[PDB]
Amino acid sequence: SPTCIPSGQPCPYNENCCSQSCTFKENENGNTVKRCD
């Protein structure tokens, strides 16, 4: 179901994380996005 974003998944804001804790990790493209704790 389309609920909160689970850990390891990409999150837009810390207000959309299942754990309520969003972070910023680097990808392989050489960029940096936000995921869930």
The CA angle 14-36-20, to the nearest 5 degrees, is 40
**Number of domains present in the structure of the chain:** 1
Question: What is the sign, positive or negative, of the torsion defined by CA atoms of 31, 34, 5, 19?
Answer: positive
Question: What is the sign, positive or negative, of the torsion defined by CA atoms of 11, 26, 37, 9?
Answer: positive
Distance set, CA 29 to CA 5, 12, 24, 26 (Å): 22, 18, 14, 8
Cβ-Cβ contacts under 8 Å for 25 (sequence gap 6 or more) = 32, 33, 34, 35
Question: Any idea which residue has 């909160």 for tokens?
Answer: 4
Question: Which method was it determined by?
Answer: NMR
Domain that residue 19 falls in: 1-37
